[PDB]
Write an enzyme that holds these catalytic residues in place. Sequence first.
Site, PDB file in Angstrom:
ATOM      1  N   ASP A 159     -16.112  -1.100   6.736  1.00 41.70           N
ATOM      2  CA  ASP A 159     -14.847  -0.376   6.752  1.00 41.70           C
ATOM      3  C   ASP A 159     -13.719  -1.186   7.393  1.00 41.70           C
ATOM      4  O   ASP A 159     -12.586  -1.182   6.883  1.00 41.70           O
ATOM      5  CB  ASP A 159     -15.003   0.957   7.492  1.00 41.70           C
ATOM      6  CG  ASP A 159     -15.856   1.956   6.743  1.00 41.70           C
ATOM      7  OD1 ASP A 159     -15.979   1.794   5.523  1.00 41.70           O
ATOM      8  OD2 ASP A 159     -16.419   2.925   7.350  1.00 41.70           O
ATOM      9  N   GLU A 208     -17.531   0.708  11.606  1.00 40.48           N
ATOM     10  CA  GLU A 208     -17.739   1.832  10.693  1.00 40.48           C
ATOM     11  C   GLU A 208     -16.774   2.943  11.110  1.00 40.48           C
ATOM     12  O   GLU A 208     -16.528   3.159  12.302  1.00 40.48           O
ATOM     13  CB  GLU A 208     -19.183   2.317  10.770  1.00 40.48           C
ATOM     14  CG  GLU A 208     -19.512   3.507   9.915  1.00 40.48           C
ATOM     15  CD  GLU A 208     -19.596   3.243   8.409  1.00 40.48           C
ATOM     16  OE1 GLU A 208     -19.798   4.209   7.648  1.00 40.48           O
ATOM     17  OE2 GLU A 208     -19.447   2.087   7.975  1.00 40.48           O
ATOM     18  N   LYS A 229     -15.817   6.990  10.672  1.00 37.86           N
ATOM     19  CA  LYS A 229     -16.335   8.306  10.338  1.00 37.86           C
ATOM     20  C   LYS A 229     -15.490   9.385  11.007  1.00 37.86           C
ATOM     21  O   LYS A 229     -14.723   9.127  11.938  1.00 37.86           O
ATOM     22  CB  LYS A 229     -17.816   8.513  10.786  1.00 37.86           C
ATOM     23  CG  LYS A 229     -18.839   7.624  10.114  1.00 37.86           C
ATOM     24  CD  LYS A 229     -19.013   7.983   8.665  1.00 37.86           C
ATOM     25  CE  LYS A 229     -20.195   7.220   8.072  1.00 37.86           C
ATOM     26  NZ  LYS A 229     -20.370   7.548   6.624  1.00 37.86           N
TER      27      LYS A 229
END
Lengths: 240, 240, 240, 240, 240, 240
Positions: free
Chosen positions: C73, C104, C106
Amino acid sequence: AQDWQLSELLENLHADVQHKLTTVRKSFKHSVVKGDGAENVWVDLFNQYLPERYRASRAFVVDSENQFSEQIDVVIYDRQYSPFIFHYAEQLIIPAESVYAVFEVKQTLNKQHIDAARKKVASVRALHRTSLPIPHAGGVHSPRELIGIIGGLLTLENELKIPDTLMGHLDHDKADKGMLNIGCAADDCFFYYDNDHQRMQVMQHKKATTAFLFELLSQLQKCGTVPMIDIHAYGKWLTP
Amino acid sequence: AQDWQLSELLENLHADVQHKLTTVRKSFKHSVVKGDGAENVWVDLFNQYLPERYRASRAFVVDSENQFSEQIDVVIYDRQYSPFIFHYAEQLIIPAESVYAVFEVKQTLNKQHIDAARKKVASVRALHRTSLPIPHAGGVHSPRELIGIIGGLLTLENELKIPDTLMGHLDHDKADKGMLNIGCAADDCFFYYDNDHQRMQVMQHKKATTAFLFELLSQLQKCGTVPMIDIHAYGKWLTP
Amino acid sequence: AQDWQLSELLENLHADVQHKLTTVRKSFKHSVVKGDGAENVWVDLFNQYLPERYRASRAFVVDSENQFSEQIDVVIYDRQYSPFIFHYAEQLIIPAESVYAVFEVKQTLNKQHIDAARKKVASVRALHRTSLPIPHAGGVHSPRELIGIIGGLLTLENELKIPDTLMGHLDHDKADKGMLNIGCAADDCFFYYDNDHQRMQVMQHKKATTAFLFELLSQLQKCGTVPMIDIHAYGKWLTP
Amino acid sequence: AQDWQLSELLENLHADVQHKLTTVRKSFKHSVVKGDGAENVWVDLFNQYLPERYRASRAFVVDSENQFSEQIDVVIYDRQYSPFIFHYAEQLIIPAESVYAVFEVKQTLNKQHIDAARKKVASVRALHRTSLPIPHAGGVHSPRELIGIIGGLLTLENELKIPDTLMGHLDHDKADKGMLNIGCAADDCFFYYDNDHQRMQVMQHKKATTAFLFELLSQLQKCGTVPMIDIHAYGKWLTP
Amino acid sequence: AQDWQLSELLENLHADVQHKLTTVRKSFKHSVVKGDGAENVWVDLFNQYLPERYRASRAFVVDSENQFSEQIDVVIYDRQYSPFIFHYAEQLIIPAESVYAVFEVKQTLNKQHIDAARKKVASVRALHRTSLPIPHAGGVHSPRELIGIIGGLLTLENELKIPDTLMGHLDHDKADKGMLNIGCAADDCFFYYDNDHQRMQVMQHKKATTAFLFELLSQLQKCGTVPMIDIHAYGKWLTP
Amino acid sequence: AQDWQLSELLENLHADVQHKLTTVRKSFKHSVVKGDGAENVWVDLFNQYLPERYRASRAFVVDSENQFSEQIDVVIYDRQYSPFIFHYAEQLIIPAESVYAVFEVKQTLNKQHIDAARKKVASVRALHRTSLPIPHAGGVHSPRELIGIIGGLLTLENELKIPDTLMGHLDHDKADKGMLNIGCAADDCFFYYDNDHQRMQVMQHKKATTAFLFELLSQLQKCGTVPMIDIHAYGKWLTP
């Protein structure tokens, strides 16, 4: 979770406007910065959110009679057709015929700052604007009507909290050069000249600066088109 | 006609510098503009003509002890390694460890403006600069020596025309926080601290601002390298 | 009113970070957008706030053994020295030797998303990184030590609200390829590997993403320098 | 269908290079354009594909002895540290100390164009490059060794198709100012000085310009570091 | 050699379009990328090759009745006059009145992808578009006629290779919201609604995407002008 | 000191124009550069000082009959509506219908360079320009009248110093394709076709290039509007 809602798109726009204006607040409230640069936030907001046919800058306005306005915190103007924009002593000076709107930037909405804004817009409307006849395939059009320049005041905090009290300070002769046609106090309200009522209106609003932006978009849509400028009326000042 | 000559390349550079500085002159001499924006011309000149490792801006300087400098007309600094540059109330605030040089911008070189420049640079050198030890493959280097920040004054017109008279106003203790290491009066001369003579030197010069630029390039070459900054000394101010 | 305070400069930074992350929240919570583009906000934040020696992008990572990571990401990497960055099928693919950090993105901090982040960083640390000996005026330096790539997880909402509970999910072997060295849950806390304690630490914080940024700046300062890359180990794949 | 393959990433790079070079071909083959602008394609390719520490331009090279090179089709140079790049008569003139590589651009690889390229690079290597001693915390380093400037020739079509025949035209004394260290004929081959063999090598290659790019990346990695330039040796030419 | 030929200029344009579309092919054919980003290539192509009055983006379309289209791969729209473009959750949302054309991007031309494209354009034509009367010097013009929005499908590979077979899939009621007015299969053909024949036409073409571009330029020339938008019909959604 | 004066704003504009033109002078007078790049200074001046609806470039002009002009030093043209601008062999080629003005750039105003300029503009006016009928809400307008393309000559030094002598060289049939409508010799004068006198006029002027700019602005205001171009007349050249 969240499905598509225009109210959410507009809340998102409003959140971005509100976040940008925190810089204006912090500038005006700082004991060293003392409002320096505050108008730049509004200039940037207008260049972000207005249609690309419009440009915004801090600037002076000039006319072909060698008359100059006061320094204007935010000028909305044309660059697509305009024959010149002067870059002089790190300032911008815009011909009056290219101007759509002029705004004064202050921390607070009160009597003194309304008066200040009127003096600024009056110094622009006092200028002489040229407009030439327009030749076309079938004849010659009369000179384009002059733009109804929008005058405004952009503030964060309302110090005239009663709408009818603020109304009494905003009421003004629509034909006078000191007329303010639009404005906002970001924390409380926006205001505008209502053509139906033929009078100023104050609207309390919880998303005032975005309501103001939509009112400004509508006023820009109607304020007119730049004229064919008498370029040689400016060029004659090149030599004595 | 003209064959290749380094003197012509340097005259061309000088002509461009001189043309840009006419904007500074016009700003300081204008009865309304009154010097507004003048430092921006010098900022732009340095961003044009200095090596790309350097950045120039009007800015304040801060340290990890929560102390701030005065407003500095031109700061030359690092962005390649620097952990932050604050953008607050439309101002820039730079950590002191990232600073190479600081300049005051005035119309004229005279006693008052020398004094003004010393107060500005002293407000930057008074700040506390951190420098951490530097781990490497074979051990740990001592903390990097702090940059010898260059202090200067940038003016157009010399009002102390006798070099020995100007010398007497520029002489200063090299170790003191108010030392000026370089400067110019574009119409007449530039000046610098001469490490051989161990004293200030004034050089009358017909291309003074370009001679100044080359002296500045040489001083930047020698003023040091940014340190490994104690980032957590700044980060601790996030909360009380 | 307000005088200069580093705590106010840092609150201003934090307010800007928080405003940018509202876009991440709105993306993850939208029933149509479903998180599309969320990582772009973090990419933009890092390109704004990290030193200019660092670049951030969504990307894949490749090595000279023709092995590829998962899609990452946010990758923080070098472009100043790096011999190539591939632009293929509208994706970016970065050589592993040029990578400093991988993250990452999220919505929530919980067991599943920690596991997801470990799988992503492990796919980058599993890659083979080259490092050539470095000739110099007096001999040849051993190959530069490989960068200790920073692995992280960037989230908005903490679903493991007890620090000791979150600690139990974050604890990991520091030498293992799935180690996470840093992360945040913007609404509640940030976390990092503490080299003194030799263990993960969770810090509850009311300005968590900005505390995270300062921890990231400190970790980047220490994670190493890009190596002299074996360019021909990549170039040999040009032909069979 | 297609999984991740470094050979496919490199074929994609090669396809982009080949497409850009069709403009070079069309320029050289046009009866009016007659090669105008051809070098600009290579300049753009290098600014796209080389590490960001490098800049490419069409330019002249100057030294502090007031000597100038011929016009160079492509110069690879430094701007991060370099004290000046002159912008004169719509040309760029670069100090010799900042130069890493110089290339001649032609349609065809043949005897005449090899000779032309040698004359161009020789005119750059003939220049005097300064290098000052470098003070540091523990003493003073000897002046940095001068960059081994890479000389090259960039062509589309090979007219010496036998490798051993081309070899015989490329062989040259490695110490001589007219040495070519690298080059390509995009349709057929690339060539370079092989430090192991201590001789020129010609490699037939079906993706020659990309093989050339990787060889160039490797040579740049090894060609040295810009010196501390004697700035006052240039500045003395300001006045007579 | 080559003298000036419009056919060569157009072959050069076509070669550039074809090279850009190789990225679309590689994206759709990749086992990991799986078409990600493919529409971005077409967006970039249109922003390169269309007149500057047009803008292209991947976007959603909204109306003042709070109705939204599907996600559109390529929207061609106005920014010169348009009162807003929403930037929400990393998506763009465009008012329907500002839209000129909408396209679906797929790898292949076949029955399923034609159906997909019709559903996308129908979701845009179903939206309510406002249009105010236009005051002028001599009266008030009727509201501007709404733009005939161009619907299209952009593909690489034709899977309905018989023109009459493809014709049978493309034939559609010109007045229906699912009408496709233009499209291409880059490897084989382009298609359009022929106003003379009053029917769809398929043209086999060896430079199909460039023939398509010229057909698109002609259709844009005729599709109309943006209306004076009812700005307050959107602004009313700011509050409940 | 200095209060606001339009004459000072115009002197400032003139000083900037004059400084930019020193590069033109230095280019033409250099024994190696020999005028290379000179037109680029004028191109840049026009892109700086003309309204944003105009673009300036060095370019060739093409028509839909496959006829091409000579290379034009400065073309003023449209990009807002224009269906294409070809980028071929590092040249720009503009459709004739999009052209407003064409200029030849030389060091000196004399008989040979007037003749040269006439040949250049004649090569553009000889081209066939299309113009389609324009549908509108109430019928179909006749095709737009073709632009009266402005032809000019831009020089630094006048070698025909007697105005009546220069007049005798400039006099030309207004209807002929070689007519020059405007020009300047920066050191001495500018000239134009006077529609009242129906004859060329030479004006000696101490700020000639700025007087020229204002005359050019006025001529552009009156030269017409781009037509609806017959796009398929160009597109038919795609295939044989």
